[PDB]
């Protein structure tokens, strides 16, 4: 479905009149500018390509400069596609703008982001492995993996065995978030709960796929 590309600004709270404190995440939205429309005839599928933000001309390459100039829009800091159907595709044309008014208060959405990077990590943190005894004669084996397999049969380590390695810094989608506020003056979405990534990261907001 068609969605929005924005930037995570930080977490805060909204107080209701009954006194309930709702934890919220604020997403800045610079209105998305359509750069290309992909169709069945020329591309074999239907999508809307958008750009957002700004980029200096010394960082915009000549190929991208021509690509943006064909659509007639200012260069953005990123380019991203949304898969669409004909119903959502109608009304959208190259050079148009998609704003925060695409959403409504109370709507349920999915938010995608790039999670924080934890670097090289061990079994305890990465896979919730249990530590061994801190005392009672233990020898330098407090946070180690333990056994990694069986004996001569099968005589190898299976694929997908949980071990130490890089954790985080990956694409994560969180489903079931409720739109708390749609501020058109500031071009801001306010959603309930936490979303992946650090402050300042790029996020994608789409209508929920679950129903």
């Amino acid at each position: 479905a068609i969605g929005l590309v924005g930037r995570k600004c930080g977490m805060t709270r909204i107080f209701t009149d009954a006194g309930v404190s709702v934890p919220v995440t604020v997403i800045e939205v610079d209105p998305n500018r359509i750069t290309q429309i992909k169709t069945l005839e020329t591309d074999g599928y239907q999508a809307v390509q958008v750009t957002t933000g700004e980029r200096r001309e010394s960082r915009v390459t000549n190929a991208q400069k021509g690509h943006f100039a064909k659509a007639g829009v200012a260069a953005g800091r990123l380019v991203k596609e949304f898969r669409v159907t004909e119903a959502e595709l109608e009304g959208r044309e190259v050079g148009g703008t998609i704003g925060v008014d695409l959403f409504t208060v109370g709507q349920i959405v999915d938010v995608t982001g790039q999670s924080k990077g934890k670097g090289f990590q061990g079994g305890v943190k990465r896979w919730n492995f249990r530590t061994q005894d801190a005392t009672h004669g233990n020898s330098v084996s407090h946070r180690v993996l333990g056994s990694t397999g069986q004996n001569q049969t099968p005589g190898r380590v299976f694929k997908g065995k949980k071990m130490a390695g890089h954790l985080g810094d990956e694409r994560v989608t969180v489903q079931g978030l409720e739109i708390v506020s749609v501020d058109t003056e500031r071009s801001v979405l306010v959603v309930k709960g936490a979303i992946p990534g650090a402050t300042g990261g790029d996020v994608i907001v789409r209508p929920t796929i679950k129903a």
């Binding site: 600004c9 930080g10 709270r13 909204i14 107080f15 009954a18 006194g19 404190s21």
Partner: protein, 117 residues
């Protein structure tokens, strides 16, 4: 004001504007809204302020009292609508920002001297 300006604006939109001045060591009464069914009433919570957090809309303060012989603490959120009103009954004179040492004192040992004008 360690947040981004947009977050600051969104938070400043909801600030209370009639908050009194109070400090750790003061004894205060808080009127708390209680709603059961369609029935609304105000319940009083009176005691000593042992901690104050100044964080704009994220401000909080902790009140300690002895209720039926059992010590109880509540950490109120300052700008929450459930806090209907705050009144300062008596001003205390202390030497530090956080009065957690009061938890280990009972009776006369836990008395706070009045701040004299």
């Amino acid at each position: 004001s360690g947040k981004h300006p947009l977050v600051q604006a969104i938070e400043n939109s909801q600030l209370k504007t009639d908050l009194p001045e109070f400090a750790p060591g003061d004894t205060v009464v808080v009127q708390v809204k209680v709603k059961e069914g369609d029935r609304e009433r105000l319940q009083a919570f009176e005691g000593v302020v042992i901690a104050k957090k100044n964080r704009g809309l994220n401000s909080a303060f902790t009140v300690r009292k002895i209720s039926s012989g059992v010590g109880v603490e509540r950490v109120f959120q300052t700008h929450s609508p459930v806090v209907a009103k705050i009144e300062v009954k008596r001003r205390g004179d202390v030497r530090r920002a956080k009065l957690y040492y009061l938890r280990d004192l009972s009776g006369k040992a836990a008395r706070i001297r009045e701040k004299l004008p």
